[PDB]
Design a protein around this ligand. Sequence first.
Ligand SMILES: Cc1ccc(-c2ccc(F)cc2COc2ccc(CCC(=O)O)cc2)cc1
Lengths: 230, 219, 53, 281, 335
Amino acid sequence: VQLVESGGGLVQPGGSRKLSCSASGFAFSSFGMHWVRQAPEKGLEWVAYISSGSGTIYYADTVKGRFTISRDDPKNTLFLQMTSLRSEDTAMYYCVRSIYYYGSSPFDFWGQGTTLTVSDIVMTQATSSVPVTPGESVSISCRSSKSLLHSNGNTYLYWFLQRPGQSPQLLIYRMSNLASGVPDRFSGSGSGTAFTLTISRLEAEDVGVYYCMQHLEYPLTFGAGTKLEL
Amino acid sequence: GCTLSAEDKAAVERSKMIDRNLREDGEKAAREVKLLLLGAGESGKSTIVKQMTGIVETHFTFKDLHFKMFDVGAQRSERKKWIHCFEGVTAIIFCVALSDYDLVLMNRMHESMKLFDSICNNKWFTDTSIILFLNKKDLFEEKIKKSPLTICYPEYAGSNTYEEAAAYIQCQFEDLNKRKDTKEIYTHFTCTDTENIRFVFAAVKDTILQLNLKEYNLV
Amino acid sequence: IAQARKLVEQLKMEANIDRIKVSKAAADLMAYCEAHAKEDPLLTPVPASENPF
Amino acid sequence: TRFPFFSDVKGDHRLVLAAVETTVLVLIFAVSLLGNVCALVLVARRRRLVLNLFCADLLFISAIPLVLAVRWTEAWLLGPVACHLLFYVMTLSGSVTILTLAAVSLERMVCIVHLQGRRARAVLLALIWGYSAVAALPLCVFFRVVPQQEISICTLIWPTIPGEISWDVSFVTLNFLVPGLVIVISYSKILQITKASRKRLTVSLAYSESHQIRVSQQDFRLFRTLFLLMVSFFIMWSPIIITILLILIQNFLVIWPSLFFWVVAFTFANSALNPILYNMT
Amino acid sequence: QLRQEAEQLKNQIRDARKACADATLSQITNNIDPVGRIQMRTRRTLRGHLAKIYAMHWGTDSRLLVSASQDGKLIIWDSYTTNKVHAIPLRSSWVMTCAYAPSGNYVACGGLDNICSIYNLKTREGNVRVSRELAGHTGYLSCCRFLDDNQIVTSSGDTTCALWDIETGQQTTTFTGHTGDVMSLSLAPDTRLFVSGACDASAKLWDVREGMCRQTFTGHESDINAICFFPNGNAFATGSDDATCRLFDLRADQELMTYSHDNIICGITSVSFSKSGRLLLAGYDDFNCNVWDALKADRAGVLAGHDNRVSCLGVTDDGMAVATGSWDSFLKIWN
Ligand SMILES: Cc1ccc(-c2ccc(F)cc2COc2ccc(CCC(=O)O)cc2)cc1
């Protein structure tokens, strides 16, 4: 399981750029793919999505008609055909592995990310910085403008951890399920609009910016991001 | 459709892709001719497999068809508990050694006759064509120049020679069919021969043609 | 005669098992059926509000 | 002049001379109804192009009540909209039936020679119906009520004679001869295939002598089955083509409105006949 | 001399069984109000299989399904939206059994290839891979049941049953004593014992650690095709080809009651119990699945709707849905 991207760099405004990632270590054709953008001010932002089979393509309402996402399953590669780039596109782009079935984990793996430099449900996190100490128990709350509890009984709420100098990783999916590879120390709870992520003990690897995401409907919207200092 | 969340819609799309892949796999599977290969152990089953644990499967393509010959002689258990699995094969290839009329396992030839009767009159293969292979022509000729068929069949009455004895064995094997109008049986004499593949191809082509006509109600 | 000895030993082991009356175990089975009768959706159909099917 | 189609004046003893074709049509209607509905149920629960035949037979059949009412009321006392719809439906469903027979034949021959998708044959049904509807427009736009003592008739007036000479023959060709040639060639090719099968088998001692006799039997039954289908098509849809050619020839000898009706009933019998022919169970 | 001793022991066992059964279960249940007419409906129909369906098994979440067919495909069903979660191709298309792991991380399959295959469902690659290839049976695999993770119990056509360790891939215990081909398996609710049905009209109770045959049950007149435990684990029901379902008592060790009718002459492919054990569902060859009152031997319903032989049966752990698989390549969920 590895995702390596290229194509980023300095680009003149109004030009074009062609991002791509090379999939390796997993069945790329059976996975949906997302492009996630993070501005230098540390804010995640969903961009595009392509299904496992091409035919279900979504865009955020800021790049639609300007960005083109394509998938080449023989070569296990994604593509972003970006045209007429502006100064607001200066950010770092990530590719996110995604699958969708009953019990699946739709936001497991993220790419390393390349820096690009150019010369809706509202999710709010109350605290942007919580200075704490290791060994204690902390809680971080995320609030949604619209109820995320669907008629199926699921609550499409996602938590992410981004260590400094690292890519985001999934912690909690559907508000109550631990992701693969993370300990049971992390716990999540909530009801409808109010959400809370609970940590039993703080370690040196738990320092970072915690993000809050909803998957109830497109476009996917991320939270502001709560930073833990210790 | 309007009441489905995004993840449910993506799961539905995945299910539709699974459906299309199943359809493609079934289409590829329907272009292969399944063949049971039965017969006693002493019969010339090995040379028939050489014509080119559990079930042994063999691939071979003569001209425009793909064949799947399944060997079931490796399973020494009760046939009626797993014979229904093969219902729907294009034909059953039955091998009998003509040289076993004078041996014993309890005469071997009558052993094959009972096995052929059990397979042919089985309810799972009411309309399944049977390609009957009669092996060891030359050994049968050698054993018939000095010994008659009377020791095998007392009611037999004919001049001791290859042709009439082979025809008599063939007609006795064919008379075990208790549904002559609907079920049809192909019979072939083989030894150093290379015509077995052509005979199997021709028999399979008929069966396909007759099944097409029986699924059209023409005749 | 090893198979015969094994069969004799198996029969001896089977015969050395304590058995109870059929009526008592039948009453126990009946009590189990009545105890969980209210928790059987097949016996008593669930209202469609709580029925995903 | 101005040939009347289903209007024919009957005189003395007509309460019994109409009580014969009303019985003919009621019997043919009921038998076609039950035959086609049973064929429909039989095909639906067997699959779980012939569906096109049976639905087209029922559509042919539905128009019959109007013809009976016309026969009892000697003039077209129905509305001026019926004189379009009745004949358009009859010709539409008839053309659909013929084209579907040819399509069934060609499907069978191809399935057999291909030694055996959905959307292709589906668009085939759609194109059959579209063609049959499009080429029957001259039989809706051109039928008119016309007083003739001054009896109103729903005849068919044609703008220019070269519009009869060239639509009559076009309908006849592309709806009877080409479908007929298709059925002929398809079933003759099935005979060729089912005979070359036996030809190659018989060479390598595949068929014994008593084997050979039964093969001949069952393989003569097949010949009769295909011969009967071919001949049923031709001699069971040919009277109406003869009637069309007759009407054109006397628009350019002496056909009676009472001769039209019996040929039309003869063609109605196709609907009660098709379930049996294509469901020889 | 050993034959005489064996006959004497069998006669002593028969006499000890005869010195029991003061009353039958019918006499005791005569005071019980009979259950009324029971009519399930086909809530969901699962399509996608193109051949005969020989096996199914219900998940522990009462939502996920697995089905085995001669297509060479193992399909995971959602059973709520009729969505297909996984489609697992099989190297051998002659599958005869399938089992779903209680933890849900694994699935099993086996058949005429004499090999039980364990598949991994939850992998990083996102596809289903072959985890272990369990070989060692000389006959066709007829039934497999997951005791837990890393342990599988399989029965084969070579008149024996084996308990495997999936990590090592080697047999840990071999259960011998049957003379016919074993065609069924069912584990106890506590996974402590299990019973097997062979082609000799006999059923045997086995101890998982001990490997010894505790008790042997007879009474059937034909080959036993399916066995299922009672929910309490003190009884089991067996279906055979003689159109007869029999309920057996583990603590008493006699035949308890018989589920038979004159109008049924066809064999029985599968048996299953409701959550409370009051309903005994049996799949027959007459294209119908009959609902039996497990206490009064009265037919309380018929699951008509399959046009071929109903070869599969299954009840969810909450006992709320019944899924029947048949040879017409259709799965129907009843409620
Ligand atoms: C291929 C096919 C299919 C169905 C039918 C059919 C069926 C029932 C019916 F009532 C009438 C018809 C068609 O009857 C006529 C059409 C046009 C003409 C006009 C000729 C001129 O003006 O020269 C006269 C009579 C015919 C051919």
